[PDB]
Amino acid sequence: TETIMHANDAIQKTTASTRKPRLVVMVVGETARADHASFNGYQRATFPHMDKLIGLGQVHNFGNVTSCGTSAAYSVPCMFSYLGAEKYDVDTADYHENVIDTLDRLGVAILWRDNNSDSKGVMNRLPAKQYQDYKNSPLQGGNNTICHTNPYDECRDVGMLVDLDDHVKAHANQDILIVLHQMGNHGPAYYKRYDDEFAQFLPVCTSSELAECERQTVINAYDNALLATDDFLKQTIDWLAAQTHADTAMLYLSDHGESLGEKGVYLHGMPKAFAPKEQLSIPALLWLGADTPFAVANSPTAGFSHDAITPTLLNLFDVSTQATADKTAFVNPLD
Ligand SMILES: [Zn+2]
Ligand SMILES: [Zn+2]
Numbered sequence: 001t002e003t004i005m006h007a008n009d010a011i012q013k014t015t016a017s018t019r020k021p022r023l024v025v026m027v028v029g030e031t032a033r034a035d036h037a038s039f040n041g042y043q044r045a046t047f048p049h050m051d052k053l054i055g056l057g058q059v060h061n062f063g064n065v066t067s068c069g070t071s072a073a074y075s076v077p078c079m080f081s082y083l084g085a086e087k088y089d090v091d092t093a094d095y096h097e098n099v100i101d102t103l104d105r106l107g108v109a110i111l112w113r114d115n116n117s118d119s120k121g122v123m124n125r126l127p128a129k130q131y132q133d134y135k136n137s138p139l140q141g142g143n144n145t146i147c148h149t150n151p152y153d154e155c156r157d158v159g160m161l162v163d164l165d166d167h168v169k170a171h172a173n174q175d176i177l178i179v180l181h182q183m184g185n186h187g188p189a190y191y192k193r194y195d196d197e198f199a200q201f202l203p204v205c206t207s208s209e210l211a212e213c214e215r216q217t218v219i220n221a222y223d224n225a226l227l228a229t230d231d232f233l234k235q236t237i238d239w240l241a242a243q244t245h246a247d248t249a250m251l252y253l254s255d256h257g258e259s260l261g262e263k264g265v266y267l268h269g270m271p272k273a274f275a276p277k278e279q280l281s282i283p284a285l286l287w288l289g290a291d292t293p294f295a296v297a298n299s300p301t302a303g304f305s306h307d308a309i310t311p312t313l314l315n316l317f318d319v320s321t322q323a324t325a326d327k328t329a330f331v332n333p334l335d
């Protein structure tokens with residue numbers, strides 16, 4: 001092949017012809033930091049809906065998880081790579097088979113909706129129709145029907161949840177992966193990231209010049225954008241909970257964290273060798289549907305990282321490959 005292969009031996013252990021189809025939503029978050037999540041002990045209710053599901057035992061919180069880098073351009077390809085953070089090279093990620101390539105080869109129906117930027121190369125070998133731009137409205141050339149609920153005409157992450165039934169109905173009796181790439185908490189204009197229903201921590205910074213504004217007002221806008229992400233995740237889970245013909249899962253991880261003025265540093269993008277802990281520390285949640293066959297994995301001693309995503313996706317689709325032996329995952333393989 002023209003691709004550097006990592007999982008040429010991959011095969012599904014079971015398929016939808018002998019068991020329920022698998023339906024997974026992977027949410028690629030944006031700029032959310034683990035220590036501003038109420039489920040990791042932040043002293044403000046930034047994730048009220050997820051916290052209620054954690055209390056019920058329906059969502060599992062993996063705690064302080066480490067991102068591989070500090071921007072979507074660096075982190076998103078690595079999140080779907082077989083390489084892992086220590087061998088990853090952003091300049092040559094396009095040349096390797098990635099986990100989406102493997103799943104597509106094995107017949108999983110993949111949809112990637114993007115309200116952020118794009119898939120950073122991950123979707124480039126799949127047909128164009130499996131990637132959908134959700135950062136533009138239809139007349140702008142995209143697909144998002146929820147862009148005109150705010151004065152910035154900014155497209156909202158919840159627009160990506162509109163009529164996901166169309167994809168499910170088009171792929172009867174097949175395994176399905178839906179990736180939703182959020183705008184999330186990207187700054188510096190945090191106040192533009194959420195509709196007025198989520199303007200709850202007040203007052204907010206309404207300038208892109210964050211070091212000018214009072215620190216707490218920057219943080220208030222950031223925390224309001226987390227509330228909107230908590231609502232997006234709740235709506236995603238509510239949709240999956242209705243898909244009772246499938247075994248379902250929702251995995252959420254941010255691409256990196258964010259500095260909010262500690263030691264004078266704001267935003268993200270610092271070289272990972274020098275980046276402060278706040279830029280590398282991300283939340284990670286897993287929801288599983290009713291009667292799930294899956295079990296949450298034993299925690300690594302140092303906590304989880306983005307390197308666990310690729311083996312987790314393979315385990316959720318019953319894919320057997322030597323490429324994920326010895327590798328950490330958030331759920332165990334089914335035997
Ligand atoms: Zn960024
Ligand atoms: Zn990012």
